[PDB]
Amino acid sequence: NAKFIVIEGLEGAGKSTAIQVVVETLQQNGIDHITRTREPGGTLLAEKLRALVKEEHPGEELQDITELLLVYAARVQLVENVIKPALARGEWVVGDRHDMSSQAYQGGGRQIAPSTMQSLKQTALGDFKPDLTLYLDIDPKLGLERELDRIEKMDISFFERARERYLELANSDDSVVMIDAAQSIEQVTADIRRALQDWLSQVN
Amino acid sequence: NAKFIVIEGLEGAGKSTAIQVVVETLQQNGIDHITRTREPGGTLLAEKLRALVKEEHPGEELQDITELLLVYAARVQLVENVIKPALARGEWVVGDRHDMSSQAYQGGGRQIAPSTMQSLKQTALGDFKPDLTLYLDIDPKLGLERELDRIEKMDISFFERARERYLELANSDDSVVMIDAAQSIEQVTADIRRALQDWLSQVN
Ligand SMILES: Nc1ncnc2c1ncn2[C@@H]1O[C@H](COP(=O)(O)OP(=O)(O)O)[C@@H](O)[C@H]1O
Ligand SMILES: Nc1ncnc2c1ncn2[C@@H]1O[C@H](COP(=O)(O)OP(=O)(O)O)[C@@H](O)[C@H]1O
Ligand SMILES: Cc1cn([C@H]2C[C@H](O)[C@@H](COP(=O)(O)OP(=O)(O)O)O2)c(=O)[nH]c1=O
Ligand SMILES: Cc1cn([C@H]2C[C@H](O)[C@@H](COP(=O)(O)OP(=O)(O)O)O2)c(=O)[nH]c1=O
Ligand SMILES: [Ca+2]
Ligand SMILES: [Ca+2]
Ligand SMILES: [Ca+2]
Ligand SMILES: [Ca+2]
Ligand SMILES: [Ca+2]
Ligand SMILES: [Ca+2]
Ligand SMILES: [Ca+2]
Ligand SMILES: [Ca+2]
Ligand SMILES: [Ca+2]
Ligand SMILES: [Ca+2]
Ligand SMILES: [Ca+2]
Ligand SMILES: [Ca+2]
Ligand SMILES: [Cl-]
Ligand SMILES: [Cl-]
Numbered sequence: 076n077a078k079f080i081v082i083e084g085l086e087g088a089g090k091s092t093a094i095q096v097v098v099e100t101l102q103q104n105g106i107d108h109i110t111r112t113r114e115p116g117g118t119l120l121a122e123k124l125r126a127l128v129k130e131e132h133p134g135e136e137l138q139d140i141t142e143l144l145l146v147y148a149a150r151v152q153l154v155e156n157v158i159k160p161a162l163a164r165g166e167w168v169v170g171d172r173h174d175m176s177s178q179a180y181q182g183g184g185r186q187i188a189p190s191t192m193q194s195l196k197q198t199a200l201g202d203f204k205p206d207l208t209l210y211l212d213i214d215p216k217l218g219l220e221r222e223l224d225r226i227e228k229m230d231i232s233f234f235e236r237a238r239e240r241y242l243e244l245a246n247s248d249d250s251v252v253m254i255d256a257a258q259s260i261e262q263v264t265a266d267i268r269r270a271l272q273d274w275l276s277q278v279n
Numbered sequence: 280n281a282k283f284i285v286i287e288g289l290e291g292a293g294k295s296t297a298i299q300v301v302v303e304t305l306q307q308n309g310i311d312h313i314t315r316t317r318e319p320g321g322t323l324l325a326e327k328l329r330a331l332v333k334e335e336h337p338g339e340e341l342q343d344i345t346e347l348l349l350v351y352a353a354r355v356q357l358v359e360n361v362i363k364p365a366l367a368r369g370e371w372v373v374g375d376r377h378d379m380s381s382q383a384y385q386g387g388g389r390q391i392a393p394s395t396m397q398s399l400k401q402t403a404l405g406d407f408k409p410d411l412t413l414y415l416d417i418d419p420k421l422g423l424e425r426e427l428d429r430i431e432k433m434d435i436s437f438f439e440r441a442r443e444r445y446l447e448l449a450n451s452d453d454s455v456v457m458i459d460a461a462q463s464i465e466q467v468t469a470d471i472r473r474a475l476q477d478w479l480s481q482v483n
Contacts, residue, residue, distance in 0.1 A: 148348040194398045
């Protein structure tokens with residue numbers, strides 16, 4: 076049965092090579108219909124919104140609530156127009172970021188009230204969630220070391236708050252598996268392959 | 280003391296000439312610092328979002344929740360970056376549409392749940408509201424008769440639902456004054472001038 080697998084983590088955790096290993100592992104397990112997505116983005120409108128979030132806004136203060144609304148608008152478009160239909164056709168979906176990123180960056184980083192984050196999540200997504208999330212955990216500075224956009228230019232305390240939120244969620248959500256991304260690409264890759272293989276072997 | 284006056288109504292009710300009469304009336308009453316706004320829009324980002332809402336989306340279904348989020352994102356930017364600062368400087372603000380339009384079009388027209396509309400309003404605006412709203416009431420067909428965008432191309436039942444919501448709000452909100460916009464421009468203009476003059480004469 077079709078599943079939604081998400082790859083998560085701070086800047087430079089290694090989500091790009093992780094997606095590679097996840098797709099390859101799925102293929103090795105006989106899954107031959109897979110759709111990758113990335114957030115924010117993945118549709119014409121969502122990509123326009125991604126640009127609005129990543130670009131600088133000279134002469135205009137981009138309010139925290141506005142940022143949240145934009146990433147959610149992009150997510151709704153992707154979920155309704157790409158992800159759900161793909162799952163419905165029987166394709167597995169592998170996402171480069173999903174809602175956990177809003178929780179970490181907008182909730183932890185921007186410090187938006189938890190009541191606000193949950194009511195917006197409910198409004199946008201209902202109970203829709205990934206089946207497995209592979210959270211690549213990394214010290215923010217180390218990840219940054221690996222033309223910065225508006226968010227990447229935030230001070231490190233923002234990313235520390237984001238990491239704190241990611242870790243809380245990884246610890247409370249049984250569907251989140253944490254990977255130590257501070258290792259060599261080879262070891263991280265090996266741990267991802269194992270965690271996913273281990274998880275696939277327990278479905279049903 | 281600085282006040283926020285909003286002009287509301289369906290397509291073609293006559294909001295453009297109404298704004299004219301409102302600003303002129305304020306000036307005649309010694310108010311010499313006034314900032315007009317229009318929604319969605321009024322900032323660089325808000326204008327980009329206005330275009331996204333008004334433009335067609337070939338090959339992509341624009342979800343109802345997405346539309347709501349976009350108009351709210353535009354509103355937050357305008358309220359925080361233009362309206363509130365203007366009021367704070369002592370300028371009166373005259374808006375061409377505001378939140379009542381979301382209630383009518385997204386709430387009534389798109390039929391978004393009331394719980395969703397209120398939680399999003401609270402999230403975006405808190406208790407911020409206009410001091411006076413002049414709602415220009417018109418039969419939708421008559422107003423349409425007076426290159427249509429994506430919303431203007433909706434069937435008339437959408438606008439009837441929007442009118443129904445506008446009227447409910449006009450009837451429940453003491454700060455909303457309803458004007459019969461089905462009259463000649465001269466008579467509508469005269470009624471607006473009177474309603475505003477009557478209202479100004481009762482402040483404090
Ligand atoms: N475990 C690792 N050790 C060292 N470098 C890495 C590791 N994982 C990724 N990188 C490098 O860091 C950079 C960003 O990786 P990327 O996968 O794009 O990160 P993300 O998508 O999480 O921002 C790339 O140049 C990549 O080669
Ligand atoms: N009371 C009225 N009677 C007849 N025509 C009107 C009236 N009010 C406005 N119009 C006309 O309808 C058109 C749209 O008016 P406008 O003020 O732009 O409407 P809105 O901004 O509410 O969409 C204009 O050509 C205007 O001249
Ligand atoms: C999905 C999502 C991403 N973001 C941020 C995380 C990233 O900084 C950015 C997405 O870009 P990113 O995934 O870093 O792409 P790249 O590796 O090419 O820079 O958007 C949010 O702030 N909120 C969200 O909901
Ligand atoms: C402010 C706002 C406007 N709208 C709609 C109402 C209008 O159809 C459109 C704004 O354009 P409109 O005010 O009609 O400008 P013009 O007279 O130049 O066409 O956006 C919403 O659907 N939701 C909102 O929250
Ligand atoms: Ca980045
Ligand atoms: Ca990446
Ligand atoms: Ca496919
Ligand atoms: Ca699911
Ligand atoms: Ca636990
Ligand atoms: Ca867990
Ligand atoms: Ca219009
Ligand atoms: Ca107008
Ligand atoms: Ca001014
Ligand atoms: Ca006020
Ligand atoms: Ca009443
Ligand atoms: Ca009233
Ligand atoms: Cl911040
Ligand atoms: Cl509709």
